[PDB]
Amino acid sequence: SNTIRVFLPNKQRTVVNVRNGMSLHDCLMKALKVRGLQPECCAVFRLLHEHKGKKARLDWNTDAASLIGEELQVDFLD
């Protein structure tokens, strides 16, 4: 794929495309930028497509191109 979803911590959702020069932070700093959020104070995750009770936690420089074709979330930080 080349698309992934971003669910907000305010329970929202949206779809984003991954380009060259992405990285989680800069790739979500698209998303949240649009939304009016900041990612610096949050933790981003990929959703539990093979887990229960736990989202798959990612890096703020994560290769979203490896989470490509999935659903992501953002939550509180650490």
CA 64 – CA 10 distance, rounded (Å): 21
Q: For residue 53, give the CATH number of its domain.
A: 3.10.20.90
CA 30 – CA 48 distance, rounded (Å): 23
The residues with which 61 forms a beta bridge, in sequence order, are: none
- Identify the domain containing residue 43 by its residue range: 1-78
Q: Closest Cα to residue 74, out of 13, 23, 20?
A: 13
Q: Closest Cα to residue 63, out of 39, 28, 30, 37?
A: 28
- DSSP summary character for residue 14: -
Give whole-number Cα distances, 71 to 7, 22, 37, 46, in Å: 8, 16, 18, 6
CA 53 – CA 69 distance, rounded (Å): 21
Identity of the amino acid at 8: L
Q: Could you write out the DSSP letters of every residue in 30-63?
A: HHHHHHT--STTEEEEE--SS-SS-PEE--TT--
